[PDB]
Amino acid sequence: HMEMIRPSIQTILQDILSFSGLNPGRSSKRYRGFKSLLSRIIANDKKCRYDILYAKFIGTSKCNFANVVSNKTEISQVIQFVLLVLGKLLPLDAWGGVSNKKIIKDRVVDFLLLGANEKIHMDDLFRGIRLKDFKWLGRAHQISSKQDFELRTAFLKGYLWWLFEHLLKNILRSFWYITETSSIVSLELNYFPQYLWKELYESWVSKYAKNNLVKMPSKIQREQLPCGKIKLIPKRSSFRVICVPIKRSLKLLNKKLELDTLEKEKREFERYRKEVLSPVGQILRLKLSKLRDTYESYRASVHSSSDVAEKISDYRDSLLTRFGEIPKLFILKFDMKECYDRLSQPVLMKKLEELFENQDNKTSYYVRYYAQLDASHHNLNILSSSRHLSVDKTKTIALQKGNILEVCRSQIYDVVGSVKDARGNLHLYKRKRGVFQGFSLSSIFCDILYSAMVHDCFQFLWKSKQDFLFVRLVDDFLLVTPDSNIYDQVHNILSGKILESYGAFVNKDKTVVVNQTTTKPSIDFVGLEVNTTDLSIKRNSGSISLVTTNFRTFKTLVKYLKTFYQLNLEGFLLDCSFGVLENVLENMGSLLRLVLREFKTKFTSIVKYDTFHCYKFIKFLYDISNYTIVKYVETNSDWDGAPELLNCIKQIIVKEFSSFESYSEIVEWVQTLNIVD
RNA sequence: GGCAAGGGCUUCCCGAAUUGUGGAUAGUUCAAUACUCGAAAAAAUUGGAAGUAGGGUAUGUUGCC
Incomplete structure (x- = not known):
């Protein structure tokens, strides 16, 4: 009941022997001292009542549902609590003496502050630690030979690895649910208390499932469909719902697979992504590229924050050359709420079919991926020979139109996400609305759909009808034009429901407006601070x-x-x-x-x-x-x-x-x- | 590098029952391991498409002529 060290002494020792590359003999007596140290630590582990220790140090509070991100406990306090747990778990011998205990504690604070896939090299993290002070590294307290020193050096590094990789991590998970924030400027982690998180998770997902999901019977597990795992990501004040594809099938999930079936399922996972899924993404990205080259309306959709700034800089120079000075611009900044969630599945399907209506039913598109050209819309070396390029090789994949459309709808409709309840019973849900965030094709699906939406719903703009600027990055929209008649037309259809035929619902409250009356000094559209009346830009403090x-x-x-x-x-x-x-x-x-x-x-x-x-x-x-x-x-x-x-x-x-x-x-x-x- | 110790690895056995300062026998080798810089010909430009000699750093390197 609430014990940090679950594995046995034998399993723990084999974890560090494999890590350090040590292969001791059956008769080895070197690790007798370590087996004793482990038993003392496990004895301290079982004696500790962590439930009351958490209430004493951290304190129990009621689950806040207004500001759902307020429940997180500050990292500073988290660091102090685990340092308290380590002090009760590890005797002085486990710290390697007084001097090493200070160094090791200092390195724990370094490790805990990293966050979001940050790592410290073990040569840096475990430096300055006196090996001599670790007596239990051998049966003798004194170092005599070089083989003994090398062997103790490997063991000490493995022991220190287990402390940080296994022990320290398992302490964090026991008390806090660690997750990444949705932000991109800050890669800091959020530590939500475990008991609080289950209340937040159950509350948010159950409300979300009412509008977006449809519960599935237990016998849907026997079908082979795209399967993900529903998780929550707090952006700054609410939760974003994403789905991470599991590296296995629906039938074999939950959870048993151990006898090397976990690996062959993972080899089938990476195969399906690289043989069909990613090739489809290339083709779908390529079809959208042609529409960008053809229509100026599709060219209004950009695929990076950098393109937005350049588009504004081009418009500034257009007025500059045409008029000599920038006239009074009517700006319109609006965005779509829950863009991925609200997406219209059937309209998305027909827009994907219009990409292949020009061609025949069996076109057999050929794809062969190279990192030098995936999204373009320097010395690549192909033509392997006996002089230059001398089981997972690079091969050309042939996908027909029928297969491409079939896998597309599979990624739209058939995707099922799992939710493990308090008892453990998994609840499988299909989606009643647009695609799940976190799936590879979900990004390109919204791009094709919204770039098609701007094409036909705003067709009045592309009739010359010139001297305007319309840009859509992903879901945020911006319009700058000196023409008032253009300003009214786009604003008129935002008050209507013509966009509601797609999964597009305008965020009525977050719509920024600058016109002849409402004169605002500047506007932040996407990470950029565009100064009004001169169109001079300067990047917001959003990059570390x-x-x-x-x-x-x-x-x-x-x-x-x-x-x-x-x-x-x-x-x-x-x-x-x-x-x-x-x-x-x-x-x-x-x-x-x-x-x-x-x-x-x-x-x-x-x-x-x-x-x-x-x-x-x-x-x-x-x-x-x-x-x-x-x-x-x-x-x-x-x-x-x-x-x-x-x-x-x-x-x-x-x-x-x-x-x-x-x-x-x-x-x-x-x-x-x-x-x- | 000579001498004197002592040790690591490998093997056997005795205890324990996720609570080892126990014994023995032969082989082997005991000052380096990791990381980072990095030269000198005929000049550059470059070090992951993975670098010597020689440095630096962390942890270490028995007493005795």
Whole structure:
């Protein structure tokens, strides 16, 4: 009853022996001391009454249903509670003495703060720990030979791995349901108390199932259909419902499979995704590409936040060249509520069939995936030979129209999600509305449907009928035009139900309006702060540095930072408008200062074991500073301020790097940088 | 590198019953393991399409002439 260490001593020991690559003999006596330590820890485990320990330390509260995300317990308090659990579980011997106990406790806080697929290399996490203080690593307390030292070194690393990978993780799951937030700017995790989560889950899913789901009988499990697992993701104040496809079939689920059937089901899972599902996604993405090339109405739909900024920058330059100045623009920002949930399944089906109505019933499309071209709408090496490309090979897949349409409707209708109740009995639900979020084809389905919707419902726009800007990223819409007659027509059909034929319901409350009367200083459409009456954009504070994950060397750090700076310094940020450098130099300064000090922060941690090469870093500074100037002159096509922009770069570099003895070389070099002669 | 210890691995047995400071026999080898930088010819540009010599870092490296 509520015990952290479920596995037995033998199973635990075999888990670390396999990890460390150790294969002891049947007569080995080295691990006698460890078997004793485990028994003491398990004795402390059973003696602990964690239920009252949680109430004492954390405290029990009533389930909040108004703000469903308030139930989460702060990570700071979570870290302290597990540190209390570890102190009762692990004797001093398990910590490796006083000095190691301080280091190990410090590393636990580091591990718990990572979140969202962040990892710390075990060479970093387990560094500075005195191996000598771990007496139980061998039957003798003293190290005598090198074979003994190597063997104890492997065992200690395996033991430390079990503490963090098995023990620490199983403590978190016992008390908290750990899940990722729906946000993309912040990759922090939410720790909802386990008893509170079951109340939130049962409440939300039961209400959701009333409008979106249809309960299935137990004998639906015997059918082979797409099967996922219903989970909840809190965005900031409510829950998003997604479905994660399970790596097995409906019949074999819940749960028994152990005798290598779990692996062959997983080999069939990855096969179905790579042989039919992903090939279908390519074809469906390709069919939408042709409609983008053909119709200007399909070209209004973009597939990235970067395209939105460029579309606005193109419209700004259109008014600029045509009129010399930006007139009073009528802006219309609206979005669709529950876009994926409300989708009209039958209308989606017919729009997918219209992609193949031009061709015959058996067209036999050929697909052969290569990461160099999946979504485009540098040295690829194919033609294997006896000199250049010398069981899971790359092969061309042939899918006919009939099969493509059959698997499409299967991913729309036949998908079934499972819900395990309190007792354990699973409840299988089919969907009464649009596709489940989390399935590979659900994204492209909404793209084709909504891009078809904008085509025919807004056909008045594409009749010339010119001088307007309509853009739909995924579900948020934006319209900018000086024509008032265009403003009224789009607003008129938003007050109607013409869009309700599709799974599109306008979010009436979140519709932002800027017109001749309602004059607002600026509008945030998607992660961008578009300034009204000049169409100058500046990115909202919605992007953080990934650096922590997997980067532990100067080479890999500057490699990402270089590719990160050049990827975030896109065209729409360098626009000058012939008078304004401030909107550029301090827009660039934000990205520049944040990437430079991010390098300084990781510097002190990784310089302890790595070797810093100043000349290589100066080349990195030169590459990004050159890229900034060439991209500034490219976008504006004229440079009234290019020397001023470089002067800003140098001042930033000379400021951030005037503290350390090794940064001195940077300061002297950067001041010599200049474009003009 | 010589001498003196002691040890690791491998094998057998005695205890325990998810609670080992127990005994014995032969073989083997006892200072490095991991990580990160990284040269020198005829010049670059580059290190994952996975790098020597030689460095740095963490954990370590018996007493005695």
